[PDB]
Design an enzyme around this catalytic site. Structure first.
Site, short mmCIF file in Angstrom:
data_model
loop_
_atom_site.label_atom_id
_atom_site.label_comp_id
_atom_site.label_asym_id
_atom_site.label_seq_id
_atom_site.Cartn_x
_atom_site.Cartn_y
_atom_site.Cartn_z
N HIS F 202 0.80 -1.23 0.00
CA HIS F 202 0.00 0.00 0.00
C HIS F 202 0.83 1.28 0.00
O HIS F 202 0.28 2.38 0.05
CB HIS F 202 -0.93 0.04 1.21
CG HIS F 202 -1.93 -1.07 1.25
ND1 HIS F 202 -2.93 -1.13 2.20
CD2 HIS F 202 -2.07 -2.17 0.47
CE1 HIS F 202 -3.64 -2.23 2.00
NE2 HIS F 202 -3.14 -2.88 0.97
N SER F 206 -0.69 -1.56 -6.39
CA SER F 206 -0.44 -2.71 -7.25
C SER F 206 0.24 -2.37 -8.56
O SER F 206 0.00 -1.33 -9.19
CB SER F 206 -1.75 -3.43 -7.55
OG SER F 206 -2.37 -3.85 -6.36
N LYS F 228 -14.18 -9.65 -8.18
CA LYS F 228 -13.24 -10.48 -8.94
C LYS F 228 -12.64 -11.51 -7.96
O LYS F 228 -12.67 -12.73 -8.20
CB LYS F 228 -12.12 -9.62 -9.55
CG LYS F 228 -11.27 -10.35 -10.59
CD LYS F 228 -10.09 -9.52 -11.11
CE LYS F 228 -9.31 -10.24 -12.25
NZ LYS F 228 -9.97 -10.29 -13.61
N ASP F 229 -12.10 -10.99 -6.85
CA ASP F 229 -11.50 -11.83 -5.84
C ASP F 229 -12.37 -13.01 -5.41
O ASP F 229 -11.91 -14.15 -5.38
CB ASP F 229 -11.14 -10.98 -4.62
CG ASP F 229 -9.85 -10.23 -4.80
OD1 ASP F 229 -9.49 -9.42 -3.92
OD2 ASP F 229 -9.19 -10.45 -5.83
N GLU F 272 6.19 -33.95 0.27
CA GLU F 272 4.98 -33.60 -0.46
C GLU F 272 5.42 -32.79 -1.69
O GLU F 272 6.39 -32.03 -1.63
CB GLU F 272 4.08 -32.77 0.44
CG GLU F 272 3.51 -33.53 1.59
CD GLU F 272 2.47 -34.53 1.15
OE1 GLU F 272 1.67 -34.19 0.24
OE2 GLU F 272 2.45 -35.65 1.73
C1 HEM Z 1 2.54 -15.11 3.38
C2 HEM Z 1 1.66 -15.11 2.15
C3 HEM Z 1 1.42 -13.99 1.36
C4 HEM Z 1 0.24 -13.38 1.38
C5 HEM Z 1 -1.00 -13.90 2.18
C6 HEM Z 1 0.42 -12.36 0.28
C7 HEM Z 1 -0.56 -11.51 -0.07
C8 HEM Z 1 -0.45 -10.58 -0.99
C9 HEM Z 1 -1.54 -9.70 -1.30
C10 HEM Z 1 -2.90 -9.62 -0.58
C11 HEM Z 1 -1.09 -8.96 -2.31
C12 HEM Z 1 -1.85 -7.93 -3.10
C13 HEM Z 1 -2.60 -8.50 -4.30
C14 HEM Z 1 -1.74 -9.40 -5.20
O1 HEM Z 1 -1.61 -10.61 -4.91
O2 HEM Z 1 -1.18 -8.89 -6.19
C15 HEM Z 1 0.30 -9.30 -2.50
C16 HEM Z 1 1.14 -8.71 -3.38
C17 HEM Z 1 2.45 -9.06 -3.58
N1 HEM Z 1 3.08 -10.09 -2.93
FE1 HEM Z 1 2.41 -11.26 -1.66
N2 HEM Z 1 1.65 -12.40 -0.33
C18 HEM Z 1 2.21 -13.48 0.22
C19 HEM Z 1 3.40 -13.98 -0.15
C20 HEM Z 1 4.29 -13.42 -0.97
C21 HEM Z 1 5.51 -14.10 -1.40
C22 HEM Z 1 6.14 -15.39 -0.85
C23 HEM Z 1 6.04 -13.29 -2.33
C24 HEM Z 1 7.18 -13.59 -3.08
C25 HEM Z 1 8.61 -13.59 -2.49
C26 HEM Z 1 5.15 -12.11 -2.38
C27 HEM Z 1 5.25 -11.10 -3.27
C28 HEM Z 1 4.30 -10.15 -3.53
C29 HEM Z 1 4.52 -9.07 -4.48
C30 HEM Z 1 5.82 -8.75 -5.23
C31 HEM Z 1 3.34 -8.39 -4.54
C32 HEM Z 1 3.13 -7.23 -5.48
C33 HEM Z 1 1.93 -7.53 -6.30
C34 HEM Z 1 1.86 -6.71 -7.56
O3 HEM Z 1 2.73 -6.92 -8.42
O4 HEM Z 1 0.95 -5.86 -7.68
N3 HEM Z 1 4.06 -12.25 -1.59
N4 HEM Z 1 0.69 -10.35 -1.71
C1 IKR Z 2 9.07 -33.58 8.51
O1 IKR Z 2 9.25 -33.89 7.14
N1 IKR Z 2 8.24 -33.26 6.40
C2 IKR Z 2 8.32 -33.51 5.13
C3 IKR Z 2 7.28 -32.87 4.27
O2 IKR Z 2 7.25 -33.02 3.07
O3 IKR Z 2 6.45 -32.15 5.06
C4 IKR Z 2 5.40 -31.47 4.37
C5 IKR Z 2 9.32 -34.35 4.43
C6 IKR Z 2 8.95 -35.71 4.22
C7 IKR Z 2 9.85 -36.60 3.55
C8 IKR Z 2 11.10 -36.11 3.11
C9 IKR Z 2 11.48 -34.77 3.31
C10 IKR Z 2 10.60 -33.86 3.98
C11 IKR Z 2 11.03 -32.46 4.17
O4 IKR Z 2 11.76 -32.06 3.01
C12 IKR Z 2 11.93 -30.72 2.84
C13 IKR Z 2 11.43 -29.81 3.82
C14 IKR Z 2 11.62 -28.44 3.65
C15 IKR Z 2 11.01 -27.57 4.81
C16 IKR Z 2 12.31 -27.96 2.50
I1 IKR Z 2 12.59 -25.94 2.25
C17 IKR Z 2 12.81 -28.87 1.54
C18 IKR Z 2 12.63 -30.25 1.70
C19 IKR Z 2 13.17 -31.17 0.66
#
Ligand code: HEM
Ligand code: IKR
Ligand code: PEE
Ligand code: PEE
Ligand code: HEC
Ligand code: HEM
Ligand code: BOG
Ligand code: BOG
Ligand code: BOG
Ligand code: ZN
Lengths: 80, 61, 241, 49, 69, 380, 96
Positions: F202, F206, F228-229, F272
């Site tokens: 914010h 976006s 949309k969401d 998984e």
């Molecule tokens: C913990 C989970 C997360 C939640 C619940 C979350 C949620 C959101 C929300 C609500 C938005 C605004 C709408 C949209 O999706 O564009 C957003 C935007 C964004 N999030 Fe996340 N996010 C998460 C994880 C991440 C992760 C792991 C990344 C990547 C390293 C990331 C990168 C971004 C970026 C770069 C934006 C900008 C969106 C745009 O380009 O407009 N977010 N995120």
């Molecule tokens: C406790 O083991 N849990 C596992 C799983 O898949 O949980 C959802 C599991 C089961 C079998 C073999 C390896 C794992 C965890 O492996 C992982 C876990 C994490 C975090 C990452 I980054 C990367 C790898 C490769």
């Protein structure tokens, strides 16, 4: 305040109609689909290729693995 | 003219609207389940205990 | 690594997303376990009450659960004692501890069969083929004294003795006790035992798919409806020139 | 859906299949002799009949 | 008149006489034959066998359940 | 102070200026829905998470049985469980789309919002990892051991870090229990950061598919994107329920239906799907320490992405070259995933090392290079 | 626990050996006996309350681990009880 400071825009007219006055999903055939295709078309030769190029490796990789399990009759041609 | 009549007595005032959804939903549930359950069972004719029950309920020993 | 043989895929009565369990079969399958497998196999997570409304009468179950003696107590002496079983009792273990079972199966440990189907790849499809499928080893394959050949089991050397054989018992419901017919049923039972919910869960899937489809359609309209205003929009750039 | 999912989760906290099992205990009125008393076990606490 | 037979072994027969099953059951015996005669071979007809059963049983499945209840 | 009551209320001014009057581009696509989904996803896991936790017993002699009881005895217990385990996947799917999107539209130029993102992911990853051990099944157990045992590759300061982490000499109760605590905690920490994530967002608004000032035409989040969401939600929730209601264990390996036994090891130990890609990279390098690093960097790399942008343009929309390199990358992950669900025998191994080798190569050399080269073709 | 507190690491081992403990099961599944080790907990004199009551007249000799903090007055109390049994005063009839 996030609505107003944005940018300086001049001489633009826009006309739109209430949802109720216009159609829900207008021109599904004459406009919709044709574009749904257009879009599809344009990208395929970007996306598809590598995905496809993977299916191969997956296939060869897998397929070839099995082959290495079956025995080679040549190992056993003089075990009398 | 249901659409008309509807928009008048029902969907007009945000109050009667809501009031409709409530009651409406009530009916929906009450009758959506029946249909669903009925459909499901039919697709499993004679496999459920609801069916093969007559064979031990008051007819043995 | 090494070669295995994957079980084919039998069309189980309950294999369809909308097809429940043929409770009729299950009831039998139950007996097959009760009079055959429950000799080396435990099913600790099931109890006679579970059977009610499923494959037996509340009556049948009580009685059925009474055919067994259970260890309760201690008493007003501290000693453990015996009593006849009640519905609230869990299917009896045939041994008291693995160390013991192994003792009476040759090191082999007949695994509890509660979650068995979901515990082996291929579930019932697998557990079927295993039973209906023991046979003599092919050339070069020598089986150690104590194990029996079964190609459907890794190592091909299972410690389990072929458990079923035609008429090895009689379905008091009339069904012919042909071997496969047994394995069929026992497998079916196994599924139930492993996931009682099964049925109700599929019944849900249905309801869920219906509501789902309808409510997505509706939302899609409303989304479009509202958005129309934008997608229909028209703009022009009319400067003062 | 809402109503359902909520009912589903709420009944989740109520008593489970097992605890509902030891819920009740029945007593046969045709096996108890005159005078003599026999005690059972109910919801943990003994029961006199 | 009423002689109890396991539909399994029956349908097991019907399949063993099938384009694939035969062109396999043959592939086995051939192995077996040589493997058995030989005294110093590490060979095993596991593979071949599976090939057969994999085919046989597939077939079996497709029909075996129509008979059972 | 103000007329209406959602701009002068120190609370509604936060339920409003963040979800209703919020300035949103008018052209953001479906790849922007993952945001809210990711949120909603959390909102749910936590809920089903508790509901389960209210019936679970963290103890190497009851963990399995409790979970089992939870399914067989608790009302809708089984249902509540499925949803949770599957909610896990749904969670990752949404995250990966979310992330990909950001990469394909240079949303990562929003540095903070990005880094917070990455962290959020990290936390999510750890979170699952612990949650997996809880049911204490074979896979639960062994996955623990295999992974935790990597730490012992660090020099000196690690052979200890491990025995500390276990609370003993091997994965045992002391661990289970602390993992449960950790699994109860982390989700909240995720929710927390998520707040910070949305804040840094914010601060700029976006990013839009075209990659050019949206100020010229922005629409109010409501009803445009709120509507949309929700549609987006349903269009996903469907398969999520569909698989979780008709094919429960389609995803989950069976060895986890076998009560953990430290004495016997499962035929194949594999995580998984959402950890597969990583598993594959870990196993590509023969040298616990190296593989560890590769794993780390395999995900840590993300932080670099921003500093690896060379195009004069932001989104790949108008950069064909980059695009395919992007899809080559995506598919490159699919492969790694697959390679991870396979043993350590030829060809797999070689295919393995390559895939990983190309994974880094792309994000490190191609992308930035093809970017520069791209720029010159525009004659910039 | 006794080591470094009231005994030698030696005393304790031996001290713990004066007892037989139930371990196992063995390769046959049977429970067996073995001599105690420092890693063992002070032996129970009974196997379950129902039994203890049996040999003390319904009375249940409580575990004495946390006893002091379990009764009001702790040791001050647990003392006086021991050093303080006596004959009842007039009107006080103690059951058999
Ligand atoms: C913990 C989970 C997360 C939640 C619940 C979350 C949620 C959101 C929300 C609500 C938005 C605004 C709408 C949209 O999706 O564009 C957003 C935007 C964004 N999030 Fe996340 N996010 C998460 C994880 C991440 C992760 C792991 C990344 C990547 C390293 C990331 C990168 C971004 C970026 C770069 C934006 C900008 C969106 C745009 O380009 O407009 N977010 N995120
Ligand atoms: C406790 O083991 N849990 C596992 C799983 O898949 O949980 C959802 C599991 C089961 C079998 C073999 C390896 C794992 C965890 O492996 C992982 C876990 C994490 C975090 C990452 I980054 C990367 C790898 C490769
Ligand atoms: C026994 C069963 C009966 C009991 C039912 C209990 C539930 C009671 C609910 C009361 C009904 C709500 C009334 C809302 C009325 C407000 C309104 O105006 O309409 C909604 C309004 C639309 O505006 P207009 O079309 O312009 O209408 C203007 C009227 N002149 O806002 C909306 O878009 C909301 C409606 C869409 C809902 C979408 C939600 C999708 C979610 C589904 C997921 C499934 C459920 C799982 C829940 C998880 C919980 C842990
Ligand atoms: C890591 C774990 C990886 C595991 C695999 C995840 C599951 C893989 C599923 C396959 C995904 C296929 C999706 C098909 C989408 C095809 C498509 O729409 O392509 C065209 C279209 C072109 O867009 P524009 O140029 O802006 O159009 C202009 C206006 N008309 O592309 C897009 O929609 C944008 C691309 C976003 C999708 C990215 C999703 C892939 C997910 C992978 C995660 C990758 C990121 C790195 C993770 C590190 C850990
Ligand atoms: C005579 C004791 C005995 C009886 C009774 C018996 N089994 Fe077994 N079963 C075993 C033993 C022992 C093993 C373990 C062999 C091994 O793992 O090496 C076993 C293993 C199993 C396994 C598979 C183990 C695996 O890894 O695939 C299944 C499935 C099973 N039995 C099912 C059944 C069924 C179905 C029945 C009843 C119709 C049954 N058994 C009756 C002894 C028996
Ligand atoms: C960050 C969101 C969450 C994720 C990603 C998550 C993930 C998981 C995972 C991966 C499992 C293994 C499931 C299985 O057996 O297949 C699990 C189980 C479990 N989770 Fe969570 N969880 C989350 C939140 C929670 C929360 C917030 C709680 C409660 C504070 C919780 C409590 C549990 C319990 C009781 C189990 C063990 C029993 C079971 O497997 O069902 N989870 N979780
Ligand atoms: C399949 O039927 C189900 O059986 C359950 C009990 O067995 C009920 O609680 C469900 O409401 C019903 O749909
Ligand atoms: C996308 C949202 C889908 C929600 C679908 C609601 C389905 C819940 O439906 C459930 O079906 C069970 C089986 O008959 C019943 O026992 C439950 O009482 C009922 O709530
Ligand atoms: C008696 O051992 C004690 O154990 C403690 C551990 O809590 C140490 O901190 C003390 O220094 C040590 O004397
Ligand atoms: Zn597996």
């Amino acid at each position: 305040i996030h609505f107003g400071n944005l940018a300086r825009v001049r001489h633009i007219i826009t006309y739109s109609l209430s949802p109720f006055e216009q159609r829900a999903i207008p021109n599904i055939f004459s406009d919709a689909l044709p574009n749904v295709w257009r879009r599809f078309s344009s990208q395929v030769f970007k996306v598809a290729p590598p995905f496809l190029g993977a299916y191969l490796l997956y296939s060869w990789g897998t397929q070839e693995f099995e082959r290495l399990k079956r025995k080679n009759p040549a190992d056993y041609e003089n075990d009398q | 003219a249901l659409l008309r009549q509807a928009y008048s007595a029902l969907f007009r005032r945000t109050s009667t609207f809501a009031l409709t959804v409530v009651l409406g939903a009530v009916l929906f549930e009450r009758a959506f389940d029946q249909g669903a359950d009925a459909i499901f069972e039919h697709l499993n004719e004679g496999k459920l205990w609801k069916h093969i029950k007559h064979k031990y309920e008051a007819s043995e020993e | 690594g090494e070669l295995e043989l994957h079980p084919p895929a039998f069309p189980w009565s309950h294999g369809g997303p909308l097809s429940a369990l043929d409770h009729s079969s299950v009831r039998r399958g139950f007996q097959v376990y009760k009079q055959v497998c429950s000799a080396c196999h435990s099913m600790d997570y099931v109890a006679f009450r579970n059977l009610i409304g499923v494959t037996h009468t509340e009556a049948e179950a009580k009685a059925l659960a009474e055919e067994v003696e259970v260890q309760d107590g201690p008493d007003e002496n501290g000693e453990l004692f015996m009593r006849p079983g009640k519905i609230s009792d869990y299917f009896p273990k045939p041994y008291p501890n693995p160390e013991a079972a192994r003792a009476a199966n040759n090191g082999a440990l007949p695994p509890d069969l509660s979650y068995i189907v979901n515990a082996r790849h291929g579930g019932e499809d697998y557990v079927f083929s295993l039973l209906t499928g023991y046979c003599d080893p092919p050339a070069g394959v020598v089986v150690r004294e104590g194990l029996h050949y079964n190609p459907y089991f890794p190592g091909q050397a299972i410690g389990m003795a072929p458990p079923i054989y035609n008429e090895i018992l009689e379905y008091d419901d009339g069904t012919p006790a042909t071997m496969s017919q047994i394995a069929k049923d026992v497998c079916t039972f196994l599924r139930w035992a492993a996931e009682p919910e099964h049925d109700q869960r599929k019944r849900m899937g249905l309801k869920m798919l219906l509501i789902s489809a309808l409510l997505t359609s509706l939302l899609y309209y409303m989304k479009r409806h509202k958005w129309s205003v934008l997608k229909s929009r028209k703009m022009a750039y009319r400067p003062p020139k | 859906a809402a109503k359902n999912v909520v009912t589903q989760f709420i009944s989740s906290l109520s008593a489970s299949a097992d605890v509902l099992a030891l819920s009740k205990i029945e007593i046969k009125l045709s096996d108890i002799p005159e005078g003599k008393n026999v005690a059972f076990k109910w919801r943990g606490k003994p029961l006199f009949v | 008149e009423e002689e109890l037979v396991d539909p399994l072994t029956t349908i097991r027969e019907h399949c063993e006489q099938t384009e694939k099953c035969v062109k396999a059951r043959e592939r086995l015996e051939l192995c077996d034959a040589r493997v058995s005669s030989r005294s110093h071979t590490e060979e095993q007809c596991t593979e071949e066998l599976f090939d057969f059963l994999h085919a046989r049983d597939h077939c079996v499945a497709h029909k075996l359940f129509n008979k059972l209840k | 102070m103000a007329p209406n009551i959602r701009k002068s209320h120190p609370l509604l001014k936060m339920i409003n200026n963040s979800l209703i009057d919020l300035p949103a581009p008018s052209n953001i696509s479906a790849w922007w829905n993952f945001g809210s989904l990711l949120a909603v996803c959390l909102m749910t896991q936590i809920l089903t998470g508790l509901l389960l936790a209210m019936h679970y017993t963290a103890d190497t002699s009851l963990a399995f049985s409790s979970v089992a009881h939870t399914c067989r005895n608790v009302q809708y217990g089984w249902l509540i469980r499925n949803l949770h385990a599957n909610g896990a996947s749904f969670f990752f799917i949404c995250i990966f789309l979310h992330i990909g999107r950001g990469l394909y539209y240079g949303s990562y130029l929003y540095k903070e919002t990005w880094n917070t993102g990455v962290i959020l992911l990290l936390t999510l990853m750890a979170t699952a990892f612990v949650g997996y051990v809880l049911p204490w099944g074979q896979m639960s157990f062994w996955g623990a051991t295999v992974i935790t045992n990597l730490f012992s590759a660090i020099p000196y300061i690690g052979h200890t870090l491990v025995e500390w982490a276990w609370g003993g000499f091997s994965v045992d109760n002391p661990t289970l229990t602390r993992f449960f605590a950790l699994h109860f905690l982390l989700p909240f920490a995720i929710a927390g950061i998520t707040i910070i994530h949305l804040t840094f967002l914010h601060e700029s608004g976006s990013n839009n598919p075209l990659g050019i000032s949206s100020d010229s035409d922005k629409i109010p989040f409501h009803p445009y994107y709120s509507f949309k969401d929700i549609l987006g939600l349903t269009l996903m929730l469907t398969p999520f329920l569909t698989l979780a209601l008709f094919s429960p264990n389609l995803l989950g390996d069976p060895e986890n239906f076998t009560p953990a036994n430290p004495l016997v090891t499962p035929p194949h130990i594999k995580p998984e799907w959402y950890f597969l890609f990583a598993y594959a990279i870990l196993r590509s390098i023969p040298n616990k320490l190296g593989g560890v690093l590769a794993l780390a960097a395999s995900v840590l790399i993300l932080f670099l992405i921003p500093f690896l942008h060379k195009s004069k343009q932001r989104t790949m929309t108008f950069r064909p070259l980059s695009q395919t390199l992007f899809w080559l990358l995506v598919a490159n992950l699919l492969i790694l995933t697959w390679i991870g669900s396979q043993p350590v025998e030829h060809p797999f191994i070689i295919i393995g090392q390559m895939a990983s080798l190309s994974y880094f190569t792309i994000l490190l050399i191609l992308f930035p290079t093809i970017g520069t080269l791209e720029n010159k073709m525009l004659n910039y």
